[model samples]
Target: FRRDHTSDQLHAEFDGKENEELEALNIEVAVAGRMMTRRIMGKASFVTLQDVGGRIQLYVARDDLPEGVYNEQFKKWDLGDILGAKGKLFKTKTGELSIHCTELRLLTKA
Candidate 1:
């Protein structure tokens, strides 16, 4: 799917919203970017995506995406992989504005 918002716009629009507020707003958006970093925690993980406009983070878990995504695809996709993601916005416990990815796909091989 085509992107609806840039990484910069993501923050411009929802940066200050509290986690509770984001949950209430439930804003869904699509974005595309290049994978820059990742923090894995077995069944779940966090990834940072770099876009032309800036950057944003995504939270992905085993149960969210289709099966095999975590065990196979997710771990296999290394740095520089281009990706597209769609999800509702959320504020991390540490206050980063991130996407709670409902859909994640490989767009291009970096």
Candidate 2:
């Protein structure tokens, strides 16, 4: 029941909006771009993603995510895979706006 928004829509909606708001929604975001890095910490992971609007960091935690899917599919995702994620937002202790990823699917890969 969740689908990501298009790049045009993301750019239009989030162009000048505060990162706090954009990173705090329960909305699905469809970012068609390159996966910059996959910092896999076993069950949890951090990814640096790049899109037309710029770049954003994605955080995936096993405790808050689908364990089966992450253990199977998400971990197989490569560094350059195009991914779509649906989740909520939370600020880290370091004040970084991050997505607490609940769903991660591979859209494409290089």
Candidate 3:
């Protein structure tokens, strides 16, 4: 939906609310953007997505995604690919806000 809004605004909405319990809020978001970076480690991965709003981190766990979505698809996606993701919000241990991705879709090839 072309972001629907801005990341700065989203960050403002949750200002001073770091490290909140994810399940408690049940925060779900749908965002589409270009893949910027990805780091994969065994069963977990972190990806950065950039849109008109700004850049946001995506936390992807192999077990949290649909079967084969992680190993078979996501791992092979190239940088600059257009993608859409749906997920809940959570702050990392480092206090960086991120989306704990539950579903990912490829919108276009790089």
Candidate 4:
């Protein structure tokens, strides 16, 4: 419900943290921006965005408990639209910082 970070802040604060360490903290973040690209990789996916500035961040790992309800809505999001995502603050497999999304929505539609 609150905007937790822009991009640089998330990166600076939690960049090198491991996944297990992040999961222990279990902190959440909310961020929004004009969409860049969405990467679909199997059941887990990621959205790449440069939010609030020139900084790049990723939104990934959507395993919602609503029985794939996120799949229905998340796919409908397109490029050049403003979207906001809320989720746990975790570092991805490659040690890349990401807001591992739980709840997400389109802020401005195409």
Q: How far does residue 110 in candidate 1 sit from its true spot (Å)? A: 13
Candidate 2 lDDT, 6-101, residue by residue in tens: 345545554455657665533554344444467776666766555543666666667744453442354455555565555444444433345555
Per-model TM values vs. the true structure: 0.59, 0.51, 0.60, 0.54
User: Which candidate number maximizes lDDT?
Assistant: 1
Candidate 4: tens digits of C-alpha lDDT, residues 13-109: 5576666765665556655554446677565666555455464445556455432324334566555676666656665565545666666665553
Return the candidate ranking by TM-score, descending. 3, 1, 4, 2
Candidate 1 residue lDDT tens string, 23-95: 5655655555555566776666666655654666666655645433532354455545555657556666644
lDDT of each: 0.57, 0.52, 0.56, 0.55
* Candidate 4 deviant stretches above 4 angstroms: 1-21, 41-43, 52-55, 64-75, 78-81, 93-96, 108-110
Candidate 4's error at 25, in angstroms? 2.5
Worst ten-residue run, lDDT, model 3?
Answer: 1-10
| Candidate 2: Cα lDDT at 34 | 46
Which 10 residues in a row give candidate 1 its minimum summed lDDT?
A: 66-75
